[PDB]
Every structure is written in structure tokens, then in C-alpha cells.
Amino acid sequence: NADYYIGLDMGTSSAGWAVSDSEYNLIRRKGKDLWGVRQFEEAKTAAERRGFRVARRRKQRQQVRNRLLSEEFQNEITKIDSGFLKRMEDSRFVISDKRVPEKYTLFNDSGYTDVEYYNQYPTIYHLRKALIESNERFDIRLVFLGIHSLFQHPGHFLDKGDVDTDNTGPEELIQFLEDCMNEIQISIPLVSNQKVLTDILTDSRITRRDKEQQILEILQSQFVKVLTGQKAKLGDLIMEEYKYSFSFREKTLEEILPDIEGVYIESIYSLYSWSLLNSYMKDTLTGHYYSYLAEARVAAYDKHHSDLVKLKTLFREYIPEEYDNFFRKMEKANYSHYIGSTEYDGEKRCRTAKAKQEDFYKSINKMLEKIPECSEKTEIQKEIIEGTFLLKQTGPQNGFVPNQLQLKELRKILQNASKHYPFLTEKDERDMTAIDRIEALFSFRIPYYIGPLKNTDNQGHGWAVRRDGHEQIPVRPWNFEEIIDESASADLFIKNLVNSCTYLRTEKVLPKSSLLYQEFEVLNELNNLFKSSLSSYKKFCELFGVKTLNDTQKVMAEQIIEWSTVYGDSRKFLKRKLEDNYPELTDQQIRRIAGFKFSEWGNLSRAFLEMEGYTIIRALRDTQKNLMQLLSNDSAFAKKLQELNDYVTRDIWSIEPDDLDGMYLSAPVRRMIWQTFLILREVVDTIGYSPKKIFMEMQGTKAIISLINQCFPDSEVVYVKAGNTSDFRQRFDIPKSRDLNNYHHAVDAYLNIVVGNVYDTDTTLKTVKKTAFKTSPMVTKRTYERKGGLADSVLIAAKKAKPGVHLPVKTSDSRFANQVSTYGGYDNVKGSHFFLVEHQQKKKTIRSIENVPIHLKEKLKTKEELEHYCAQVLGMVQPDVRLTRIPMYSLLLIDGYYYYLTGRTGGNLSLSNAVELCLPAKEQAHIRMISKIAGGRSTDALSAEAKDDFRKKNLRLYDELAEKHRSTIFSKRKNPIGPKLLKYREAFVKQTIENQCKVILQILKLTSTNCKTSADLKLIGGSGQEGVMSISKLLRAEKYAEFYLICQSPSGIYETRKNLLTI
């Protein structure tokens, strides 16, 4: 009949919608005004979820490496201690919960135990120093332990250098760099200023650029502009534009060895290599440097010891009564809290969370104040400012340690053991000894383009290409090149990220430098008639010799463009592809191919460009053609498109589950669009026909107008300029009080229908004004099942953990699931949804609303499953599940007041206000103006007689807001506020303007549906968390006069009240 309109105000946390005819005056359906505010939560991005996924895979890989490393030492360790590998696995458990009841974690011999092992080696670095320096035959368990600790702390893999160097001081290798004097003679001042040259380049805190400028002032390309880390020009390497620029940070000389072949020759690597390894290993007492990182930590261990005796003497000499509170006692950020353990008065060790030195340093500064100034006090205060006082080896500050620095200790420890344990040098079928495998395991990490090495089910992101006959074979560092087709899988990694075709949907686009795609741009410009060019042909005819490309070298040429784009840089792939497939090209030909680099992709695919309409690429050639009429309905090429992809537009009207995937939409936008569809799908069907127009307002909107244009094609979607609606609120006096209620979202959607259809194209104003101030809009909240973490991410202390309330470490392990107060557990166990169960408590039939935990959601879907859960776990007598799913934030009507079932509070149910406050339109402007003063704007620069008006207007509002909480719907809440609002009335007058306007907004937090109901009415004398309402878990029929559950559809058109006291 009469076509209607739909306006939308779509936002990341709420979607407002409105329905109107050609003359506003909202359409009426099911006896309701057809507008409302669909509210929900902002959708979480996948970045956090990806954080745990990669962390899980990293933990999985670290567990395999620990397993494989243990199998290398498995046979030799068994000869002395069979259970050593299993003793380490039994570490968390108390002596009564481990497989073998042995007290100590690692060593359980007669002479040697954990107490004796730490007397010889107080720290792991002390063990490693013995493992490296000493040539005595060590116990294989100690050798394994030293190697194992390096595996736990491998260091970063960012620095590309040659650990393989045996040993060479900076004085020695500089002499080699003096050689090759074919330069402008900068290589000799390498020896002259070597003392300043070595330390300045080694210094790890000097900025690399500032380090670069100062050194050349004494050495006066140059290679002195590359030590920072950047591309290096080959202008001076005995023969500019032939850069093949290598940056020492990005690529290894061995990797660039084929690149530099056929051309200050190679030793310039060593000086840069020296800087990376020895930057952080500089001795302070002397001028030299340590050899291995273990040697640098025993020295740091001894400085911390020397720092401790200074603090102990200072405290005992000056404040001996405060000595006991800082060292032999656990408090906030004292020394014991810093170390994380304490042992005094013969009591057991009190191991807790460790303190950060920032708060620990602050604790000494406040603690030295009561000591009069002296030499030691100034000296200790000096070190704290420098940050070198009482340092610990492990912590967030060890992000500098590279793998090559740790690889040096691995080789030295393994080499020192080969002279004593022959099992490390027994070769095998691959001619690899144990050392060749441990060293390979240590430094080998999967390259970023391989991804996960297995796809048990095709549900993950894995794309690795296993070679034929190598499936279901574990990948090792030595098996990596055989099992995994590294070139083929790296092709997929780039390919999967490539965009899809603009018109066709199943084929990836072609490179923008590909031959046929380079054409499509030029004939597009030919029709327009230059901003485009056809240059790949101009470029590729040099390689092939022939000036004009035939049809047998064009397919030759296009495979190179794809390879030079998919395999950009990383010449081990491009060169391998050419050499094996096409051995015809010579060395200069291959090197010239790497010379040009294109890595951009077009908007269209190869399959689309060669479609048999009656090839579209030739269609732009023979005729002049129109830019968009070629693929429009007026032509036969459009029909050819639909046959290639059987997918239909809009999918199905009633089925559009996840059509938003692949459109590069953030998770907040995807949820915000989807709930918009849940409304329109429910309005166009409740009404008979489809809306003539759709108005919307939130540049990614172009991706949004499109996918909705699929829905209801006959509609005329209109986008209204942002800020146009706010102009209507100004000139036509329609204030928007965002802090009052959520009705503005509906009005914003409603006004969207007004600015539109008038910007594009009586008493019209009166109808809009009357509608704009209506209380009609139906505000719904998206009910859902809570997703995310099952509980808190980290375990809490066993002292703070109690059974039943805290999720154990492992539920399937009876050791953890039964001793939550012994091993700790996960706090705040999140629940998915709620369900209603009727049980007999105190020999009386009552009902309670219990929750289904997120970790039990899948096995608790049926009523029989839920009843069994109540009987055994919840402990209910004769359970009878009446409702199986009460979602989170479900509407409840309790004693006439509407709430939201947000969560739970121990034995209670947390509720939030679901009722909208409605103040008269005159006080809407004052609240909007109150927020700005509380939001930062100052009342000091105000008229002396406009400020007494401020107090009185504020007084009237507080007096009015004291009435809605007294005699209105807002008087039926739990924990009422009206009695308390009058109680603090004398403190509302007796306060400044700013403070008495920061409580008005806090009061308004008690009648807002967007936030949890609570108020910071502490300025007027109440509490910072005031007004929280929380009913009991049990629905006693005598306590509540009524208790419903309003199940509303997303538009709210269909409601269903389920009396929780009956059904």
C-alpha cells in the first residue's frame, strides 16, 4: 500500500531504528509505535583472542622442544637417575600428589639433593659458568640442566649475526678491517681510534644515529652511515643505482652471499656482528668485556649482594627498629616482597608474588627519609636514580638477550661435554650427531610464512604444504625442507592474503604489474579520452631480447610477474623458481629480474578478464565501449558473469548468517550491522511490503551501503551527512540529553528520516516535534550467552582460593579439581547464561535462577543434562528445570520494576536498571549543560548573577530527581535512593558549583540503562559505589508479588512474558 521509510542510527554499542510513512507519524503495528533502540555491547576484536592462540602454540612448541631435548639425554640420564625426567614433570604437586614421593624437584640422591645443588651453584648462571669454563667431567644431569635452562630462555631471534666465530677481541679483527685500502683510507683510522671506536659502537644505550655521527668525526658510501641499521648503498665497493641494498639488521651476509657474488669486502660484517653480541656484555670494573652471558650474570649477582649489605648496614646503624619490617617480613614492596620469599623465626618459606622494583625503589626512598644524610645514603640514592641498585637477573628487563649470545654457551657446554660423554658424537642415518640436533632444535623457529604445520580438521588457519608421502610425519629442523614444501607453502601464505576479484568472487586478483592487467588500465583511459601506463611490456622485452613480445613468451613473462610479486624479496624463492623451471636464462638475466620489484595487486582476476561472453579484455579493444555499461544489464557480458558464480545477491532474505566475512570489517562493526539486520528482517515481515527508503548514519561506510543494498533491492538507501541531524536539534529546539536516557538513539534514527527526504527532496514541524519528545521508543538490550575466558586468566593464591567458587587448575585431574585450596585456582568463574530450576529446600518447593558456566556450556544444553547438573554439582533436592536458557542481560519484571539480569554476585543476582528516566523537556537542556561544567568547563568565568541561578536550577533538579525516586516507577526498586537523596539534601546546597554538578551526573547514573546502576555520591556524603541493586538467587513466591521474564525479539514487536513463579 502506502510505502514507508526506515531510519537508522547505527553505533558500536547501540542501534536505533524508526519506521515512518511519507509524512512521519510512525507506523503502528501490533499496537506499538514502530521505533526503538536496540542496545548491545561493543564487540571484542580478535586481537586478544589471537594473543592466546599464538601463546598457546608457542607453549606447545616449547613443550615439544623440551621433550625432544630430553630424549637426546634420555638414555645417558637413565644410567644414574631413571626418574629425573619424570621428577621434573612432578613439580607443582605436593609430595603426596606426585608419582614418586620425593621431596626435592630435581636432585634426590643421597649425597646430592636440591639443598646441596644450590650450595654449589646458588644460581643457574653459576652452573653455566662452571659448564663453560671447567673442563672437568660434569654430571650429565647438571649438563642437561644448564642446557635445559638455555632452552627455557633462548633469547630473541632478531639480530642476524655469526655466533660461529671462535673468539676474537675488538683489537684483533679491527686489524683485518684496516686491510683492503682501496677506499679513501677510512679503514686505517679503525685502528687509530679503536679504543673510542670499539666502546662507542658497543655502547647499548647511545642512540644509533648519534653514535653514527660522532665516530666519523674521528675517521674523517662510507659504511659509517649503516651501523644504525638501514639500507646500504653500493656506491663505493669498487663498482650506485645497483644497490641491492643490504641492511645488516635485516639480512645475514651468508643470505646475501649469492647477492654480493660477482661484484671492506666481508670483515665489515664482523664489526657490526661484534656490536650486537657484546653491546650488553661490557664489564664495568675493568675495560674489557665478558665472554659469555653467564659470566656477566655472576658479576651482576655479586653486585646485588654488595648492594644488599649496604642496605642492611644502613638500616641497622640508623633505624634498627625498622630493620625487621623491611627485610625479615613480607609487606607491600619491601625487600621480601621484591625477592618474593622470606624465611624467619624458623617458619616455612613464604613464597608470594614478587614486587616490581619501581614500587620497591619507592619503598626505600620513603624508608631512608628517617635516616640523616650521610655518604652511604647519598650513594644508595644515586644508584636508585641510575637504576642499578639491587638488581635481579630474571625479569622484564631481559628483552635484549639474543639467541646468538645464548648459542655461544650452548656450543661451549656441548663441546665441553663431547670430551667426556661420547653419546653426543655418535652419528646417525643423516650423519648428524646429538649436538647437531640439539643446536638445530635451539635456534630453529618456524618462519612466519609457514604457519602451523598441521590441520587435524580443516577448521584452523594452517596452510603448510606437505610433500607427497610425508603426511603425518613430525617436522623437525632437519626434516623441515623435506616434509614441508617451503616454496609451495610460502606461495599460499601470500596468496591467502590477496584480495578477491571485484566482480567474480572465488579467484584472487592479478598483480597490478601483470601484463594483461597493465592493459586494462590503458583501455580504460582510452575510453575516458595519461595517469596510467603500459610499462611491463616496455620492461619485459629487454629481458627476452625481442622488442615485440610473442604469445609464447607472454605466458613466460606473466609467471615471472606473479613470482616477483608473491615472492617479493626473499631471493631463495624467486631464484629457485627460475633456475629449476627455466634454465634458459643466464646469470645476468636472473639478476636483472630481481633488479625490478613490483609487489602490488590489482582489482580484478585473470578468470574475469578472459570470460567468454559470446574474452572481456578484447571487448574494450574492438569498440569504444562505456566504462560501466559493458557489464550492465544492457549487455550479454553481465549474464555471463552470473553463470560463473551461482551465488545470488543478498543470499536469502531470511538467511544471511555470516555474509559480512571477508569484507575487512572490524568486529564492533560486524555486530553493529548484524543487529541492524535482525531488526529490519523483523519489520519488513511484520509489515506487508518493503520500505521505499532507508536512512542511516554512523570512510568504511561505502562497504556498508553496499551489502545492505543487496537487502531489499527496491529500497532507495540514503546516507545522511554527519552533523546534519545535530543542526536540526539546534535550529528546531530538540535537545539531546545523552546522560538522561537512550531515547535519542531512536530520535536520531527518527530525525534521520526527516533530514533525509528533505535534503534530497502543513504542520510538518509539529508532527516531528511531537514525535521527538515521545516516550514510545522500545528500548531492548541484546540478550546473549557470555563468551570469552572461562575465569580469570591467571591463577590466584591457594590461600585466597576456596572450593566450588574457584575453577581448579585442571578439572579432569583429581589432584587439582579436589584441592583448589592447595594448588590455587581461577577466580571469577564466568557463567554463560542462566536457567530456572524448581527444587525442594527446607522441605518447601521454591525456585532459583542458577547459571551455566562457560566451561560447561556445551554439555549442559538439554533439560535432562541440566537436571543432572543440579542434582550432583549444585546439590538440589528433586530438581525440575523449568527454563533451559535465560540469557545474560535478560529483561525481568520484578515487583513492577524492570531490570537486567547482568551477572551474579555470589549467592545473589546482579541487576541493572531497565527503566528509562523521563524529565521534562526544559530540564533536558540543563542536564546537557551540567555535563559540560563537570566535563572540564569552568564556572569561574561566569556572571556573578548567573551563578546563583546555577545553584537554584541545580537545586530544582535534585529536588525533582528526589521525587521520581519517591512516588513513581523508580520507587519500586530494590535498595531505593529517594530516602537517601533527601538525606544528603543539605550537602547539595553547601558545596561548590563544580562539585554539586558532579553528583547530579552521578545521580543520573542510577536511572541509565547503558551502565551498571551505581553512583559516586561521595561529595554529598554517601558512598562511591551507591545504589547497586541485587536480589537473592531464590525466587520465593511470597517474597515477590510478581517475577516475570519478558522475552522480546530484537525489534521488540513480539514479547513473551514467562511467569518465573509458575513457568
Place this chain on the structure above:
DNA sequence: TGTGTATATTGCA
């Protein structure tokens, strides 16, 4: 942020 949740305080008959 903001909030779900355990935890704590406060009357109170």
C-alpha cells in the same frame, strides 16, 4: 574503561 564477581560491611529482629 566498565563491570562481573567475590567479598565486605551494615544493621537488625
Place this chain on the structure above:
RNA sequence: CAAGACAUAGAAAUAACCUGGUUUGAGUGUCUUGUUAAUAAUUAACAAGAUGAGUUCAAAUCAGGCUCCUAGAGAGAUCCGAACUUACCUUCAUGGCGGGCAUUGUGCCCUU
């Protein structure tokens, strides 16, 4: 003078890494007096006084799922598991969710 050469900055998705952190356990605490105990003096228990140490390691790190067993505080695999989707009712259908007035306080009328 718009490309480009680049730089830098941010967002999104994915992959590969590091430092940790957290929890539990290990890293033997020792002396003095007093009280009360077992039994001339000791060994505990407890309380109050003191006192010396301290830097690390091991294992787990969403619950869990997956393969195989010949069912275990078992092996395997090293990847699935914190993002996105769901009102309610049914034969799970392009089904249903009665017909209408109000719209500042959660109502009213006609029907089943």
C-alpha cells in the same frame, strides 16, 4: 605536479618469536629466655625476645577437545580451545509469536 622513491604514524586480520608474569613446589633457617609437656637432664609443643639468609630453578599456563588404546594421575599429535552468529514456541516451515488504543511511570479495549 601528479606519479614515484620513500619515510614515519595508526588501524584490522594472520603467522612466527622474546621477556616475563602468575600459581604450586623445591632451594634443610639458627640461637636466647619463659611457660607447659612427655622423660637428670633432654626431646618436642607453645609464647615472647632476638638473629642470619635472600637474586634462581622445575612444572603448568583458558576448562578442555582430537588420534590411538585394550582405559591410565596412558601414549600420540603440536593443533582445535578467550573473535564473530542465536528472543520465544513448535510438524523445525519462506513457520508461528490474536486484533487494536494509549505512551511521565508500565496501562486499556475487543478476542482465544
Place this chain on the structure above:
DNA sequence: TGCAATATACACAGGTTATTTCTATGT
């Protein structure tokens, strides 16, 4: 002598490399 209604405290995070989409600038 609990006990219901109110009010309170608080939570894993800081870096790195690479790719592909997508902007922002000056340079």
C-alpha cells in the same frame, strides 16, 4: 545469631619480526 540488604575491591602485559588489506601526513 545469624542474616538480608548494601557497599566494596579489582582484573596478565611490555616488546619484536613478516605479510596483506586501509588511512594519514610531509619528504
